[PDB]
Subunit: 292 residues, 4 copies
């Protein structure tokens, strides 16, 4: 039904001098992303510092991005947490501010079973008419959403997609095979963009598209074109740059990276800190290595 | 200055058939635990389903338990989350309902650095006059609080202890050595209580204590008296019982195990689920092997 | 300078009824592989039971295979162990019996350092005129050959290729980037053939080519042309088959598979065991699932 | 029936300037060990550089050591490899030269199943009248000997003990419970000596005993006596010294340390290397921190 395209951007949440949401800055970023290869936007996810956002802040931010986007591009809210009843609640608030879909992380910290996760997600999906996108992220939640559990959930009418940040393209290939062709499997690891599309992934849910969305769209087109040498050169830029962006807890690297190219998005909330000088210089070098 | 004894219990939060906090049963539980080896109570932590509790529910639970306990035993509130300012607010609210200390978990899901975790814990600790216990749990949070971070934090007057669910008694031994005598180190793995205390741990923060607390206090005392053959046999029982309480996601096994011995404290909130019949049968068998 | 093709095959070693090498069944196997997509043969390596072959056997086997191959395809001898001195000696015997390259595994069991491995591999390389293929297999040896370490070794004149079974195509990409264009990087994991070649890998050192060589050859031709539909359809057969060959320790599965499809190559030597009648049935129905 | 005592030492193999076995230094070392707390000797194991020994060197070293010890202490020869037939042969030769027992490591590199390891160890044990000590070392063989497998093997009459380097004192506790009283369980991890004996282990198969075997014997006595705070100071020294001994690949550090305390045993064979000047300086300072 819906189509998030090939690059959904996991959008930072810009903050002012005091650490409150900066809604004018949110408006420059949303416009820039759309002008630079972003085909769908994920609002208030991990990369949006969802942990330190309040539910009132999350809803303000969803409402504001819905307005500024203006149907140019689907808007996905990160309404999912480790509390099912809380997730049903924030899901309904995002629906009522007119977001286009919801992203639902695998619950973190409380280590649910596969059956437990199945009911979590079945219940939040039952709570909305909207399209749902699953988010598998063992590297933050510990648990995997097993291939079998995903295949079961795809069977549900408004569960349409999965961001798979498992780092394993063999697991993805199994999910593509065993799910219907209208179930869209997305990589959630930038550097695996090319190999995952190689095996059938529709695209990437990205963090590096904040700074190299055009190049990414280029890479994808060149690989779909059978121009492998072209794609591989761009693939390697993506990998280099992605690595510079996770040398410290994300999203401080990518917020700092955006500043270094004249788009200030403020700093970060504790427990995250700003880059050290050392860290700044290192990222700086990599941002300079980007061709123009 | 503050002493939590040998067995601090990570107390479940009893629920009714409709998943609401059952305060009468909480009273029954508090008094049972104190009559059966519990030397300190942790309220509203992981085992108490902190993830599915509202801020308002947590503070009401803290208050009830401060009131029931009536100073017989110290009361420790799990106020720390992956969000620092919110961890500060919850901590004030708990200070105000009369708790004796707070426990602060290593931030889950957002994956902070050691310097970020250092500033996290420092800030919460500087916000309260209460004693502070750390909580290392890489098996739920992914990150470890490093030994050196733990040591730096130990130097803060009101950071007086740590629960190390890290699974590694050599790391514990390094913390013990490098910290002053007045920093208390607890195991957070029931199965390791015996070997942890051999290397100089003060005791355990326990889940198995809900059902075999009397056998645990007895195990500790035999060890302390050099009755090694006795301690080994009880340790063997503790390891067998503890394993049976974590075949499904905690705290569900232990809430079932309490119902089996007469204290029915309800079920669990989503994304967690009741034991299956097959799962109950297995657990039953193990409880039926605890000596009378 | 030497060209191993898109599909090198890590050849099983046929044993007779008393467990000795079956030289006639070896002849038959070699001729089959070359007829079914294999572009280079790897003799007496992990998959050909190197741990249970005597050094005499290894050399008798290298000789015969060279004879039967008759220069149709490169022959690569598996002459590296975790003993540098013995690896030089067998590399020498191998050379005298006229193989075309040697393959050298990361030392297993003794856990050498990056610098130790560097000296291991540099010393074996310098002992011989032949081309050398490195073999990274942290899943059997535990240590990895680090990108920097592979790069330094690539600068050595006869070190021409790597087989990388580290399972990580992002490590692969980095070896490709930082090495000269004349350093061939092969996947050592069947299922990663397509994503690997996507990022610039030259091909695969395969086990599954024993039973689906032609299909893999077709998948690679499809992919190199830009026909991603048929590539992905065959990639999915590859992954399924590969998986069925690794449910019991290798090479017991693929030897058994060879017998099911019409080329019996005997059993294995201890500590390896025959598949259970039940493991047989399971594998047999994956084999019957291959389109004929 | 046979008693290896509290501290079996995993003995290094002294090499001369050319890398050949040094029998004069072997003799010096056996006598030093025996006067400094070693209650049994493991010859030609991992720590003795078995990978880079020839079969003939191994048996030569078994012989020399046997005749030097002159029945003063049991001699355990490390005849087990990842090849069952080879292991039967080496075991038959060790037996003819008069060792008291054999150690048998879980096969490395070829990744055998629990039932393959069962048949591998059974066949080898059946081949000799000598006592047999199992060796679990997943940090070098990747596979684990499962608790059930160990229990089956302990029913064999000449399979009388296990060195468990699995890092896990709870798997050790289970083995102890499930096997009979006459199956002895040692730690294979020095740092874990104290807490392993707490849970019922007979003692330690050790590397630190080459330099602080007197202190270990002191610590063990203190624990058995109930002088727990005295055992804990020695434990801290154990763990700290042990860690300096595994910063580079063992046994280069313990051979370095031996020279520092006046017992030169030469260097190591490739693929292992001498400590750097750096690594030496750092190890030295830990050796200086031992009380003399």
């Amino acid at each position: 039904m819906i189509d998030f395209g090939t690059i959904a951007t996991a959008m930072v949440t810009p903050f002012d001098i005091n650490g409150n949401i900066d809604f004018a800055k949110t408006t420059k970023l949303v416009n820039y992303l759309i002008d630079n290869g972003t085909t769908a936007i994920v609002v208030g996810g991990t990369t949006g510092e969802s942990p330190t956002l309040t539910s009132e802040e999350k809803v303000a931010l969803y409402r504001h991005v819905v307005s500024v986007v203006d149907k140019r591009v689907p808007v996905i809210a990160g309404t999912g947490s480790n509390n099912t009843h809380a997730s049903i609640d924030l899901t309904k608030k995002a629906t009522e501010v007119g977001v286009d879909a919801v992203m639902l992380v695998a619950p973190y910290y409380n280590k649910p079973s596969q059956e437990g996760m199945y009911q979590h997600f079945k219940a939040i999906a039952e709570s909305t008419p909207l399209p749902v996108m699953l988010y598998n992220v063992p590297g933050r939640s510990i648990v995997q959403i097993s291939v079998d559990t995903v295949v079961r959930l795809s069977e549900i009418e408004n569960i349409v997609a999965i961001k798979d940040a498992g780092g394993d393209v063999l697991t993805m290939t199994e999910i593509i095979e065993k799910t219907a062709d209208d179930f869209a499997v997305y990589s959630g690891d930038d550097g695996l963009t090319l190999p995952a599309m190689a095996v059938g992934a529709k695209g990437i849910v990205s963090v590096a598209s904040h700074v190299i969305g055009n190049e990414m769209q280029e890479m994808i087109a060149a690989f779909q074109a059978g121009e492998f040498k072209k794609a591989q050169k761009l693939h390697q830029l993506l990998v280099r740059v992605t690595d510079s962006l996770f040398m410290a807890p994300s999203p401080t690297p990518v917020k700092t990276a955006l500043q270094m190219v004249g788009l200030d998005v403020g700093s970060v909330r504790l427990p995250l800190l700003p880059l050290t000088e050392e860290e700044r210089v290192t990222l700086q070098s990599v941002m300079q290595s980007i061709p123009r």
